[PDB]
Structures are given as C-alpha cells and as structure tokens.
Amino acid sequence: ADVAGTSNRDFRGREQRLFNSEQYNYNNSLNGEVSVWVYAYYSDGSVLVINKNSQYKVGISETFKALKEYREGQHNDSYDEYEVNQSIYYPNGGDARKFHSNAKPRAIQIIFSPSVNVRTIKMAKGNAVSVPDEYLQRSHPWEATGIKYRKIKRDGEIVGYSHYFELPHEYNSISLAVSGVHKNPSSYNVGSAHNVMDVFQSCDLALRFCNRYWAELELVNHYISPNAYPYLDINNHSYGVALSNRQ
Amino acid sequence: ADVAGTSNRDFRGREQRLFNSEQYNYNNSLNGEVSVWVYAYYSDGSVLVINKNSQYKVGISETFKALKEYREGQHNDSYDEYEVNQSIYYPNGGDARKFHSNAKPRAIQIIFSPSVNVRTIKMAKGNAVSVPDEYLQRSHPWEATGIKYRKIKRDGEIVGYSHYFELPHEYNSISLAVSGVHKNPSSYNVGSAHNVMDVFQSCDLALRFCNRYWAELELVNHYISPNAYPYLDINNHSYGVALSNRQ
Amino acid sequence: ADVAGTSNRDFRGREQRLFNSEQYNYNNSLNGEVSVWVYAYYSDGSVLVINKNSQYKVGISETFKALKEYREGQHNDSYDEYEVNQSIYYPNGGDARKFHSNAKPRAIQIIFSPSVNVRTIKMAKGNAVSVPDEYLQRSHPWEATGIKYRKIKRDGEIVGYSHYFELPHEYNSISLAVSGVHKNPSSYNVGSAHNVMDVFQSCDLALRFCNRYWAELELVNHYISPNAYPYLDINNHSYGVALSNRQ
Ligand SMILES: [Cl-]
Ligand SMILES: [Cl-]
Ligand SMILES: [Cl-]
Ligand SMILES: [Pd+2]
Ligand SMILES: [Pd+2]
Ligand SMILES: [Pd+2]
Ligand SMILES: [Pd+2]
Ligand SMILES: [Pd+2]
Ligand SMILES: [Pd+2]
Ligand SMILES: [Pd+2]
Ligand SMILES: [Pd+2]
Ligand SMILES: [Pd+2]
Ligand SMILES: [Pd+2]
Ligand SMILES: [Pd+2]
Ligand SMILES: [Pd+2]
Ligand SMILES: [Pd+2]
Ligand SMILES: [Pd+2]
Ligand SMILES: [Pd+2]
Numbered sequence: 205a206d207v208a209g210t211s212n213r214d215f216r217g218r219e220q221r222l223f224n225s226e227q228y229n230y231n232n233s234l235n236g237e238v239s240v241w242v243y244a245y246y247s248d249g250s251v252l253v254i255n256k257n258s259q260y261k262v263g264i265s266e267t268f269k270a271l272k273e274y275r276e277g278q279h280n281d282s283y284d285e286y287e288v289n290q291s292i293y294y295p296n297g298g299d300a301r302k303f304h305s306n307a308k309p310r311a312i313q314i315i316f317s318p319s320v321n322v323r324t325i326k327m328a329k330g331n332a333v334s335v336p337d338e339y340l341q342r343s344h345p346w347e348a349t350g351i352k353y354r355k356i357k358r359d360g361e362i363v364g365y366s367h368y369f370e371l372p373h374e375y376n377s378i379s380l381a382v383s384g385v386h387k388n389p390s391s392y393n394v395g396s397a398h399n400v401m402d403v404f405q406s407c408d409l410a411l412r413f414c415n416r417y418w419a420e421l422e423l424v425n426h427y428i429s430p431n432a433y434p435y436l437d438i439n440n441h442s443y444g445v446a447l448s449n450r451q
Numbered sequence: 452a453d454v455a456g457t458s459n460r461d462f463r464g465r466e467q468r469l470f471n472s473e474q475y476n477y478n479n480s481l482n483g484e485v486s487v488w489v490y491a492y493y494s495d496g497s498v499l500v501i502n503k504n505s506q507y508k509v510g511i512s513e514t515f516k517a518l519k520e521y522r523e524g525q526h527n528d529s530y531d532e533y534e535v536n537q538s539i540y541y542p543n544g545g546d547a548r549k550f551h552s553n554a555k556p557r558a559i560q561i562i563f564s565p566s567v568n569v570r571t572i573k574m575a576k577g578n579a580v581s582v583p584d585e586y587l588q589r590s591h592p593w594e595a596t597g598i599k600y601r602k603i604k605r606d607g608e609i610v611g612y613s614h615y616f617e618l619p620h621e622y623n624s625i626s627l628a629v630s631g632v633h634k635n636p637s638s639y640n641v642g643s644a645h646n647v648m649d650v651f652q653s654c655d656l657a658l659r660f661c662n663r664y665w666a667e668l669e670l671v672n673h674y675i676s677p678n679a680y681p682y683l684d685i686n687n688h689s690y691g692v693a694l695s696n697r698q
Numbered sequence: 699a700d701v702a703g704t705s706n707r708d709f710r711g712r713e714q715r716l717f718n719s720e721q722y723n724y725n726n727s728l729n730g731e732v733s734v735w736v737y738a739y740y741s742d743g744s745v746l747v748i749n750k751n752s753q754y755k756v757g758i759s760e761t762f763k764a765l766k767e768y769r770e771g772q773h774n775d776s777y778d779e780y781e782v783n784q785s786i787y788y789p790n791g792g793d794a795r796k797f798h799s800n801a802k803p804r805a806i807q808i809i810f811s812p813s814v815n816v817r818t819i820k821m822a823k824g825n826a827v828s829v830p831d832e833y834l835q836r837s838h839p840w841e842a843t844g845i846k847y848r849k850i851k852r853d854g855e856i857v858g859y860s861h862y863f864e865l866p867h868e869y870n871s872i873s874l875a876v877s878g879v880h881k882n883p884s885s886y887n888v889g890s891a892h893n894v895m896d897v898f899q900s901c902d903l904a905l906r907f908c909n910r911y912w913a914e915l916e917l918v919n920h921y922i923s924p925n926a927y928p929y930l931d932i933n934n935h936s937y938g939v940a941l942s943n944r945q
Binding site: 507509510512514515529531533536544573580582586589591592626632643647650654 | 724729730749751770811895899902904906907919920921925927941
C-alpha cells in the first residue's frame with residue numbers, strides 16, 4: 205500500500221475528513237437538530253443550564269421563579285424565598301428577611317447551535333410577573349436579538365452563537381423566553397402543508413435538560429466538553445469542535 | 452400659547468389621548484399579546500393565579516394535582532395529599548385521613564384579555580384523571596364556551612372577558628385546559644404558510660406566571676391593579692383600565 | 699311487543715350495539731382524541747404513568763430526572779440522588795453513595811390509543827443529557843418505531859398499540875419523547891391553512907396526567923380498567939374494551 209500521509213490513497217484520512225464533514229453538514233440539513241441553551245449564573249459561582257434540542261425550531265421559556273437558584277437536597281430558605289418573590293412581583297409586597305436574594309441570577313448567557321439561522325432568533329425578556337414591556341397592552345411579544353449574538357469560533361469555524369447579558373442591578377428581575385429556527389436556505393417551507401404535522405410533532409419530540417453545576421469549571425469539564433457543545437467562558441475563551449473539512 | 456383645556460391646540464391633551472388609544476389598538480393588532488388567566492379559589496381565601504401571555508394564541512393546561520393548593524415553605528400534609536389523590540382518581544382508592552381536602556379549588560375564574568376573539572375560546576374540563584367526558588372513546592377534546600363569557604367593562608369599554616364556575620360539590624374534582632386565539636378581523640391567516648413558523652415560535656416565546664396570593668384583596672392590590680389587568684371580584688366589581696380614546 | 703333476543707325489533711339491543719359502535723368510531727374521527735401513555739417500571743414494583751390526551755396529535759417528552767422514581771410524601775434520598783444524576787451525566791462526575799439507583803426505571807412501555815396511525819409514531823430516546831445519538835451533530839431527532847408496536851387486542855378488536863423495552867443494564871440511562879398523530883384516512887389535512895390554528899390550540903388544550911402506582915395490580919385495577927384503557931401486563935395479558943359492532 206501507499207505510505208500514510210503521502211498520497212491521495214490515504215483512504216483512512218479521507219474517511220476521517222468525510223466523517224467530520226458529514227457531521228457538520230447533517231446538523232445543518234433540515235433533518236438535523238437545532239439546540240438552545242440558557243445559562244443562569246449565580247453569585248455562589250454555580251450555573252443552571254437549561255437545554256432544549258429539536259428539529260425545525262427550538263426554544264425555552266422560564267418564569268422568574270424557575271430561574272432562581274435551587275440547590276437539590278439542600279436548604280433553600282424556601283419560606284423566605286416565597287416572600288422574596290412577593291416583594292419582587294410588587295414593591296414592598298413581601299415580608300422577606302433579606303434585601304437581595306442570592307438565588308437571583310447575576311447574568312444570563314443564551315447559546316444556539318450553529319444550525320440556527322441567527323436572523324430568526326427571538327427573545328421575550330419580561331419582568332418578574334412575565335410581562336415583556338411594563339404592561340401587556342403596549343408589549344411586543346419578542347425582540348429579534350440576532351444582531352447581538354457573537355460567533356463562537358474554533359479553528360476559524362462557527363461552532364455556535366452567544367448572547368450574554370449581566371443582571372448586576374437590584375432591578376434586574378426577569379422572566380425569559382428565547383426561540384430560534386433551524387437554518388433553511390431552501391424554498392421548501394418546513395411549515396407548509398406538506399410537512400406541518402411533522403413540525404407539530406417536533407413540539408412533542410424535543411428533548412429538554414436542566415441541571416445546576418457548582419462552578420463554570422465543572423460545567424466546562426463535565427457538560428460542555430464531553431458533549432462537544434459550544435460555549436464562551438467568563439474569560440472569553442471559546443469552546444467547541446470544528447468539524448467541516450477537518451480531521 | 453393657548454390655555455390648557457380650551458382649544459384644539461392642547462397638544463399635551465391630544466398626545467395623552469393618542470398614547471392611550473395606541474396602547475388599546477396595538478394590543479388588538481396581530482403584533483399584540485393575547486393573555487389568559489386561570490384563578491383557582493381555595494377555602495382558606497387564597498387564590499392561585501396562572502397566567503400565560505403570547506402572540507397569536509394562548510392557553511393553559513393543568514392537572515388535577517397542579518390546581519390543588521400548595522403553600523410554599525409551609526406544611527402541606529404531602530403524604531396524606533398523595534393519598535387524597537389516589538382516592539380522587541378512583542373511589543376508595545386511597546388511604547387518606549380526611550373526607551374533603553381543603554386544598555381542592557372551590558371555584559375557578561378564567562379571564563381573557565380583550566384581544567381574544569371570544570368565538571375562539573375552547574375549554575377542556577376533564578375529570579381528575581384528565582379525561583374530558585368519562586371515557587376517552589366518547590370525549591370531544593374541548594367545548595367552545597365563549598357564549599358564557601361575561602364582558603368585564605370599565606367606563607363602558609371591554610377590558611376583558613370572564614367565565615366563572617363554582618366547584619362547591621364533593622364530586623367537582625377537575626383537570627382543566629383553556630385556549631383562545633387573538634382577534635384577527637383580516638383575511639391574513641397568521642397560520643398560513645407565510646407566517647406559520649412564527650406561530651411555532653410563539654409556542655416557545657409565551658411567558659408564563661404562577662403564584663398563590665393569600666386573599667382576593669392581596670390579588671387585587673398587588674397583581675391585578677398594578678399590572679392594569681382585567682378582573683371580576685366576588686362582589687361582581689370590575690377591575691381594569693379603559694384606554695380607547697380616553698385621557 | 700316482540701320477545702327480547704328473537705327478532706329485528708329488539709330496539710334495545712340495536713341501540714346498545716350502536717352506542718358501542720359510535721364510541722369506537724367517534725374516537726377515530728378527526729373530532730376524536732388520540733392518547734399516549736408512558737409507563738416507567740421500577741424495581742420496587744411501582745409504576746409511573748404519564749398520559750396525554752389531545753386532538754390531532756399527541757406526545758410526551760421527559761428528562762432523565764423526571765423518569766426517576768419519586769415517592770410523594772416519603773424520603774427519596776434527594777441529596778444523594780442529585781449526586782447520582784451527576785454521575786450519570788458524566789462518568790465519575792458525582793459523589794453518590796450507591797452503585798445503582800433503584801429510582802432508575804427498569805423498563806418502559808409506550809401505549810397509544812387505537813386512534814393513532816402507527817406509521818406516524820416517532821420516538822426520541824436520548825441519553826441522560828437529552829441527546830438522541832451521542833452528539834447533537836450526528837443525531838436524527840427521532841426514529842419511527844411503529845413497526846415495533848404490538849396490537850393490543852380484545853375479542854379480536856385492536857384496542858391499542860404497545861411498544862415495550864427493558865432497561866436492565868447499568869448503561870440504560872435515558873431521556874425519552876414520543877409522539878403520534880391521529881388517524882386521518884381523508885385528504886383533508888388537519889394542519890392545512892383552514893384548520894391549522896385549531897391544531898395550535900390543541901397544543902394548549904391537551905390534558906396531561908401523571909401518578910405513581912405501587913404495583914402493576916393497582917395500576918390495572920384502579921387506572922387501566924376503570925377508564926377502559928388499553929394495556930399489556932407483564933404476563934402478556936391484554937386489557938381494554940372491544941366496542942365495534944358489539945353489545
Ligand atoms: Cl435537507
Ligand atoms: Cl396587524
Ligand atoms: Cl371526521
Ligand atoms: Pd441555608
Ligand atoms: Pd448597567
Ligand atoms: Pd409548539
Ligand atoms: Pd432541573
Ligand atoms: Pd482564551
Ligand atoms: Pd399542617
Ligand atoms: Pd350545583
Ligand atoms: Pd404549540
Ligand atoms: Pd408557581
Ligand atoms: Pd361594584
Ligand atoms: Pd429512605
Ligand atoms: Pd441486553
Ligand atoms: Pd405544539
Ligand atoms: Pd406527577
Ligand atoms: Pd393471558
């Protein structure tokens with residue numbers, strides 16, 4: 205046989221490159237997943253991740269209460285935290301024994317898979333009673349925020365998109381929903397009559413995940429990296445795997 | 452300048468009226484929200500509210516168990532309440548130590564925003580195992596109940612719609628879902644191929660809220676009124692804000 | 699009058715047969731329900747049931763965590779079970795004090811109502827972090843598993859469809875979603891523009907149920923049988939009610 209790495213008959217190397225390329229491309233086909241992650245960062249260094257994976261379109265919608273830190277199997281000040289909520293829903297509406305709940309997120313990072321079309325991203329960032337803009341009567345139900353997403357890149361390939369915002373002020377008390385649509389450069393509408401019932405099924409079939417990791421280190425080591433997910437850490441370091449035309 | 456309140460050049464007054472009118476009208480445009488609230492009233496005077504706000508269409512679906520009173524951070528008889536559930540799902544199926552659980556709702560009020568089309572309202576009022584009419588084989592999945600909705604009015608303007616029903620009998624053990632569609636007097640179908648994927652995203656983007664208030668007083672003062680929401684209290688008093696062509 | 703059971707003027711018998719037949723047929727009309735059940739079987743003999751009932755299409759999507767046994771009002775080792783989860787999401791990622799959590803399901807049975815079209819059934823069986831096939835980049839979002847469904851029959855009539863799989867190995871740690879579409883032998887697409895907004899409402903109106911029964915006996919006696927639901931027990935015994943052209 206020819207010698208490895210010296211001619212066009214290194215079929216092992218050609219198959220390696222094709223295997224990676226096909227992964228990249230399959231995900232971007234209409235058969236492929238689109239995924240979103242919402243990361244909520246707490247003052248104790250812990251991080252809640254919420255992930256949804258679906259065909260065609262994907263999104264996550266959470267209440268104010270759902271985004272607050274919850275330590276499974278530990279004490280969570282749960283009566284006092286009911287009261288915090290009451291005081292957040294209406295000023296002076298509660299009887300809490302603290303000024304600022306350390307369970308409130310300090311920041312949020314939204315990440316989409318590279319299979320989203322960024323122009324389709326929509327976000328409803330509401331207040332703590334789930335109203336997008338002060339009063340329902342004047343609320344648009346979402347903002348198209350794609351322009352603010354940064355490309356997460358590795359080895360010059362886009363591995364995902366990130367939108368990050370801090371909530372460092374006392375008044376940053378939010379509800380949040382986000383949604384994006386899988387790329388579709390074709391003229392075949394996935395929601396056209398021929399395929400609409402499959403998009404309806406996709407609502408049922410989407411897989412969801414949530415978990416609280418104790419540190420960004422643990423999130424990177426045991427959630428982002430092992431699953432080849434895209435990420436951007438507090439130091440602006442990019443995580444993910446470049447696959448297109450690569451060994 | 453002209454004197455306030457004496458001519459057509461009180462631009463401050465014209466802008467005030469337009470600001471209110473635009474709020475009213477924006478909500479009724481296809482860009483605007485449609486909202487629903489389900490209120491579950493307990494014997495202790497407390498009230499669970501569940502709210503969803505979305506574009507195009509909106510709804511809420513809850514189990515029997517989800518509608519039972521839950522006091523956050525307090526004792527809830529949780530083992531005995533598992534047994535109550537078993538005895539509600541099948542007669543004599545449980546081992547509870549009470550005849551009637553005071554956590555069961557005594558009544559339900561469904562309220563829609565004035566942006567719903569009442570003719571589109573649908574309700575699935577099921578039994579405690581989530582079957583709409585005794586057996587699935589003979590169940591229609593919903594009833595169109597719009598005819599029963601009362602107009603909540605303020606200053607002669609419709610600020611919302613209410614459907615209220617008591618559950619005063621031992622056998623009133625329910626699951627409940629409701630749904631309504633945003634008004635659309637046009638011939639542009641929001642679910643037509645051109646816009647269908649946006650309705651799909653709206654499923655992701657809808658913002659949800661739930662909370663238990665200790666009294667209808669507290670609900671009115673700290674939830675209904677501050678958010679300019681429509682409501683009808685036990686005395687048939689109407690709450691909400693009239694906006695159309697008003698200062 | 700004629701004597702019972704001796705001529706074509708036993709109108710009571712004709713009405714009995716029609717009453718049963720109409721139940722069978724109504725469910726199979728486009729007005730009728732389609733239902734799905736997911737049963738998760740635990741080592742202690744208990745069974746979680748999750749049911750959804752809807753028009754047009756139906757499905758259930760659960761996380762790894764949601765499928766683990768939870769005993770309401772009893773001790774559930776909840777801190778240790780947080781750690782089990784961490785060790786399931788990533789090998790050696792947790793600090794649990796057990797090798798195998800007895801809360802993990804040992805098997806799953808998926809049952810659809812006889813109103814589903816089996817060819818439309820789709821399943822996303824993911825790993826414990828909700829990825830269908832190792833990495834999102836190479837995951838198809840579902841498999842069409844209809845071929846594997848067995849017909850549950852009674853008195854020669856199909857009363858439902860079952861797909862059963864054991865999870866007897868340590869590595870059988872799953873997330874799961876399933877979806878099926880109501881039969882529609884017509885050329886009227888329920889998701890066509892004329893009716894699409896009703897399918898959107900059906901997402902809101904679907905009724906859901908979940909409960910943990912302590913034994914398959916209790917599940918059969920107090921959940922399957924009283925509601926005329928189809929089922930297949932560990933002995934391959936079929937449950938349900940034959941209705942078509944029957945008294
Ligand atoms: Cl494609
Ligand atoms: Cl409009
Ligand atoms: Cl029909
Ligand atoms: Pd503590
Ligand atoms: Pd700032
Ligand atoms: Pd949906
Ligand atoms: Pd979680
Ligand atoms: Pd770096
Ligand atoms: Pd108590
Ligand atoms: Pd009555
Ligand atoms: Pd939907
Ligand atoms: Pd709640
Ligand atoms: Pd009054
Ligand atoms: Pd224990
Ligand atoms: Pd095996
Ligand atoms: Pd849906
Ligand atoms: Pd449950
Ligand atoms: Pd048998």
